[PDB]
């Protein structure tokens with residue numbers, strides 16, 4: 001190809017070194033959970049082709065013989081396109097490993113019918129409804145907002161270390177667990193970073209434009225660095241207490257023109273000067289200049305009381321006992 005500026009730089013030293021593709025890896029049978037040990041209850045989120053329901057699981061844990069869970073599944077209206085994606089989503093989760101700030105996978109029903117993905121249940125729901133619920137009380141506290149901001153930073157650091165690009169980081173995809181523990185969810189659009197080069201076929205039809213970095217919209221480039229842009233948008237959501245990004249702006253020619261020119265959202269009412277600067281660094285137009293998720297945690301860690309780090313580590317270690 002003759003136009004070299006349109007070729008993205010591609011990174012393998014010798015034939016001995018291969019990319020471990022999680023899509024190609026075997027399914028550990030220990031994830032399997034009999035379908036007749038799962039009762040399905042109320043819907044937790046739904047869409048045209050799928051839903052997440054609350055479930056009770058009997059005998060999934062030795063600690064909790066009757067345990068509340070969530071269950072990701074497809075509707076009858078879903079086609080084979082949605083069926084292959086849910087499978088690949090299960091593949092990404094079985095190989096990620098567990099983390100304190102991820103809605104962890106507990107099991108799956110893969111053997112007979114449609115796929116069920118069984119995930120831990122988060123008592124408080126998503127961060128957008130939670131922040132709407134508490135708006136009047138705030139005016140929750142400010143430290144809570146910082147704590148949410150740190151935990152997502154650690155969650156994302158864990159994902160990027162596994163070379164996993166989330167591609168839909170947003171407040172609607174942050175849940176709150178029993179001890180005000182923040183959990184990232186929805187790996188439907190998640191891809192390994194080497195996925196787009198090795199098995200090239202994509203075409204998600206509807207995208208979260210207002211959360212996406214310029215090079216993701218315009219060039220279909222998804223990296224950890226475009227996740228960091230989304231993390232900036234997530235921060236704006238949290239400190240506007242559940243606000244809609246770019247409020248009053250339709251996504252159109254002029255919107256894309258504005259973002260490309262350097263337009264950015266103004267500071268939200270409940271963000272400090274220092275916290276707005278984090279969102280600004282996150283929306284740098286040159287992706288390589290955005291801060292890393294490790295660096296972001298270190299910045300946000302400074303904004304929290306000194307003991308928080310020690311207590312957060314105590315929760316974290318305990319979770320993996």
Ligand SMILES: Cn1cc(-c2cc3c(N4CCN(c5ncc([C@@](C)(N)c6ccc(F)cc6)cn5)CC4)ncnn3c2)cn1
Pocket residue numbers: 044045046047048049050051052070072073074086103119120121122123124125126175185186188
């Ligand atoms: C009021 N309240 C609510 C909760 C709550 C809510 C969750 C939860 N979520 C629910 C939202 N999610 C979600 N919704 C839709 C999709 C789809 C439509 N795109 C989809 C579904 C299936 C499919 F195969 C493909 C696509 C995906 N995911 C998951 C996270 N998970 C755990 N606990 N929990 C607890 C608690 N109080």
